[PDB]
């Protein structure tokens, strides 16, 4: 995870 | 220490039987049970075998699909159900035992039961003299007893084994030489006295 | 008299063994004696060795974990059959002399003295089909031509025979197994008391086992059901030794004992392999290859032996369990268990010669 | 615009995406058709490869979310992507942990492993991992609306509860359940494994096993650590938004997936049965008897 | 399936003579060969197993031996109670096959048959001629047609004179008979 926000 | 067979008798072709072999002194799990048949005037032919320790079950290629062998372990009994009995199944069936662990031959055998699959019916033996012997014909089924002079000359007579004639009914002969011959058919319970 | 022979895939050397089952007496094991037949012309400078190996397998034949084999070698003994080493002074067995007389002068003997306190041949039945390789202890005789011992040995120039290390029932019977238990639940009144025994100690495979059970239910608490079971315990000793459990036979009678009453009965249970084919990891007697085997025999051990015997150790017990139905002010469906353990020996009788 | 500092991000999200998808497809295909999933290790490797492929399929959506400076797809696409991302990170790491403990009991407890490692038990474990990660995934899916942020349509997570609380709740309960419980389990189990392998040519295999388990745990803690440390740093106090910032915040996100890229090399294409299968894709006499006259 | 061939099919020995029965196996049964003894009207009795091992209680005069796939049962000193049919089973493979059997018989001096002919009685034709060989030896004997297929029956070896007896019946027509 880690993307979007 | 003993095997007792039961369940044999006259059958018709296509019928069924159920032979029981009671084993006394043996454990069905420490011994395997075999059924071996001997045809009239022939050698021993193995039929079936059951091993209750493994649940193994074997049949000869001439009885597969028709004969089924099972065991009631609680009663220490082995059963052989015979269906679709062909005329070539007439024999004497023995139940034998072998050691389950390291089989070393059929140590114990039973007295054997006669299985007859003839299609004929119970008839009476017709007696004919020979001017000095006698011949009994159509004496089905076997056995048939005969004695000269109602038992007087019992030692000096020759009785030949019953031969299955072409019709299926049996035939037998007896002879004595330097009278009267009495013949008894037990399946038909018939006594006939002839004077030659 | 017959002897077993096996040949190398190329057919150069051949190994002869008098027998493939070696009885393991507690004090010592029967030596593995045999002959190897070679040809010195084929062996330009090579030497034929024979090794005896005791191999125990932890799991399945597959690596499938990091690429390693779960197979320990508990015992490896090796000997240089040819050239005949002048160092040793081992004598010649009568069968070895007869084989050397039968074969040419290219027949050379080998002998292996298996040390005591080693496991016998047991194979763990895996239940359903998962692998084509069995799991357990085995003994292997391996003959090979090599320049030195520390060398990858060619598979076409080597014979391997699976041999058997077996044990038979002791000549003298032992004490009759018996067990006692006195149990009270809420210490109301005189307690439940169970006493079980067997008809004898040593049983043979396929032979029925008779358990005489006597219960004095002196309390006010009814017992509903009685389970007799024959259980096989497989102490699979290794690094961090463990123990395996398996109910081999069972008879669950519904005999009830009223409060403050007495009940004596005899239950006959026979352990056989027909109804235990679905139990994974069941100790079987371990035949040579896929064949007709049975439940593994009890492993006999010395009284002051090393408790950490690597491999599988087989034992058998009979558990007699009274399930006493429970319930008081609130009637619950749970129940208590009063059990006794009767150890017994399940072996093969010594063959009669 | 596409300046040399703005293109490296698409380079990362492209090479990582292609290597991950490609490797995971190869290993899933070779497992399903050739090896046929007839073990527990094959079941675990297929499950891990599926989870890794599903996690790495999220990369195109994140790369084009970056370059466009917004999220062009839509509400359903934004939810599916975010839940796939979270769900399959969790499932990837949990399958890593279950495979690690499986190897641990297959090495240290081999006689218990003999009966506790049937393919039925492996199938049960996969289902359990999936259900465990599903519970986390469902809240994430529900709370991932698209807000038309002024100038974008960006796809973020929205917690209409007291916000700065539940967001940090999820941010720390993904840092403990999906970082430190796995880095504990893997390290502990592989340490106990090498201890029991050392407590017994054999040294050559021990050294090979050790060089492989250490590289496994090293690649895990090298890929997954930078982004977690970086999220923690971004959540303590603000950070300036510059070139180094905006290329590092993507290089870290790309290592997070680089783990999923390198898993086939470490677990499948290093396996003994699988190397054989990849290669496929690219004599004993009988015991007789003889007489012995007396 | 293995065929076990016994030789001879029948032999005539005397008390004290050494009797040898040979059993050849088609395939190679290792040592799983048993020898059994059956007397008329009685169940077989195991005599030897493993081709050499004497069964418990069997007299020591019986001995088994093997050479390759050729097994042999030897009775050292034949006794009057050791005259029955001997069978050869092989239990290495399923099915277990038995030999045809060797009937050991007592030996006597050659005897002359007493041929008689009996016509069909008038009470029957209102139809079977019979030829009767009385108290002959040895067993082998032929019948000469004299007035369809004739049925022959032979008794067991006589307990008194160790001799035989044969009777052949034939159903004829009324053309040549009258």
Numbering used by the authors:
A (entry chain P): 1 to 5
B (entry chain H): 5 to 135, 148 to 194, 204 to 221
C (entry chain C): 6 to 358
D (entry chain R): 63 to 262, 270 to 351, 363 to 374
E (entry chain L): 2 to 127, 131 to 151, 158 to 188
What sentences appear in the manuscript?
Activation of the μ-opioid receptor (μOR) alleviates pain but also elicits adverse effects through diverse G proteins and β-arrestins. The μOR is the primary target of opioid drugs used in the management of pain, acute pulmonary edema, cough, diarrhea, and shivering. Here, we present the cryo-EM structures of the μOR–Gz and μOR–βarr1 complexes, revealing selective conformational preferences of μOR when engaged with specific downstream signaling transducers. Integrated receptor pharmacology, including high-resolution structural analysis, cell signaling assays, and molecular dynamics simulations, demonstrated that transmembrane helix 1 (TM1) acts as an allosteric regulator of μOR signaling bias through differential stabilization of the Gi-, Gz-, and βarr1-bound states.
